Write a protein that binds this ligand. Structure first.
Ligand SMILES: CCCCC/C=C\C/C=C\CCCCCCCC(=O)O
Ligand SMILES: CCCCC/C=C\C/C=C\CCCCCCCC(=O)O
Ligand SMILES: [K+]
Ligand SMILES: [K+]
Lengths: 258, 258
């Protein structure tokens, strides 16, 4: 049946996409990993020699620092993790499935409660993004009909994709223009953070709204909430729309394979 | 219009869900954060006093260790990040949007390439999970019809939810029974990892398949790939099904509000 042929074809194409990506990423920056690890080994050797410290004592101390960093210590001045604001940021990253993982539950009660809270929250949010998308399609259809009348049916998926690309770029550039002066990131690092957050990938190498102090903290936190919400809804809509164009491309490939 | 009333009602309910979660999590484990941070300050003081080291030199050394850990050093013996196997794990976490973030791109070329690779990969995968769900619904309908004939229409959403709960528990218990002896995690930590991976939240506090060596590495990596794939597809299906039951509950609340 054609639905099974589509499913197996898509699985094969995704597996080839993973093998191709793995072949590319290991070529771009395996050299950088090995340089940074060599430079670390040189720094650790210099520290060992300079202070008459054995690698045993240093490995013990660094094991304690690995424990402390999971509790949320940093050498930079970082906001408390489980004040009400930090917990609100945490639940925001759970419920959107971004999961930066700078804050993570540590008690068994927290671990248990997460499994139910994330279970209902993530379902409620995937509902929210589907209602958002249906509203956005309705708004675009209304505007396009008003333009058709102003020149005196629903929009096609390609023009919706071109609209959502424009929205995603405009939000991402505004967010980058906010994070660049406030967080001190480079502009390109802030664009990369914007994509990593809005796609809900969320590695957590960069996280906004973390220093112990900012000018106008409340306004900055509110703007960060608004920008992350708008970005996630726009890029998740873009993912759905591209997924529909992929499905149509698979149906075309299977038709041409007839 | 009823669609706007549903959208605004769901936004209000989600905002109250975030405020309630933030109020709960900050109560469960703010005491643990402050204990672990005090114990760290005590360890750092003991190390400073014991080796005649100033907090300036130690802060410098720890800043270098924060740089080295982002390049993927650990005190434990950890697998190279950007060999072909590590890059395949990375792209697996990008394309599923899990994003554990133990491996992250560091060159500008890697950061650029991620924005296009994740853009097409995540759309292709959200397509894959929607084809998976349509196939699973078709299989459940066929089996239920065969049972109706064996007792000699599509299934209702509630029984699909009860099936997907059972599948998610059975996969999660099998995965936990694999990770517990091999990774040395506690059983409950491995269940929590299973949920955090399968929901695609992916904090990255726990990550499987990371030590420099295992018995039967190839079989273990293959089993880890299979279990994470099956888990993500089952729990993402469960999220969709619960989101439909939420939508029906909102429609009921709006009807009763008439
Ligand atoms: C009004 C509708 C709300 C819908 C919410 C749904 C999903 C949540 C999505 C994104 C929010 C999480 C990002 C961080 C927010 C807190 C930022 C801060 O405090 O610094
Ligand atoms: C056959 C169909 C494949 C579909 C793939 C789609 C999405 C990918 C989802 C999950 C895989 C990522 C988890 C880690 C895999 C590598 C594990 C390892 O190497 O240790
Ligand atoms: K994620
Ligand atoms: K993460």
């Amino acid at each position: 049946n054609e639905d099974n042929a589509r499913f197996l074809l898509l699985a094969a194409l995704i597996v080839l996409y993973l093998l191709g990506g793995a072949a590319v990423f290991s070529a771009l920056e395996l050299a950088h990993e090995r340089q940074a690890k060599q430079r670390w080994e040189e720094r650790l050797a210099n520290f060992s020699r300079g202070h008459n410290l054995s690698r045993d004592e240093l490995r013990g101390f660094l094991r304690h620092y690995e424990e402390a960093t999971r509790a949320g210590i940093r050498v930079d001045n970082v906001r408390p993790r489980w004040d009400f604001t930090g917990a609100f940021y945490f639940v925001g990253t759970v419920v959107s499935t971004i999961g930066f993982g700078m804050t993570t539950p540590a008690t068994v009660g927290g671990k248990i409660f997460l499994i139910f809270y994330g279970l209902v929250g993530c379902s409620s949010t995937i509902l929210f993004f589907n209602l958002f998308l249906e509203r956005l399609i309705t708004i675009i259809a209304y505007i396009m009909k008003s333009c058709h009348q102003r020149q005196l049916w629903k929009p096609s998926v390609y023009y919706v994709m071109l609209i959502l690309c424009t929205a995603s770029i405009l939000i991402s550039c505004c967010a980058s223009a906010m994070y660049t002066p406030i967080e001190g990131w480079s502009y390109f690092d802030s664009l990369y953070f914007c994509f990593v957050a809005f796609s809900t990938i969320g590695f957590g190498d960069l996280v906004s709204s973390q220093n112990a102090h900012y000018e106008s903290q409340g306004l900055y936190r509110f703007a960060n909430f608004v920008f992350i919400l708008m970005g996630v809804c726009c890029i998740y809509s873009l993912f759905n729309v591209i997924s529909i164009l992929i499905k149509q491309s698979l149906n075309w490939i299977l038709r041409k394979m007839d």
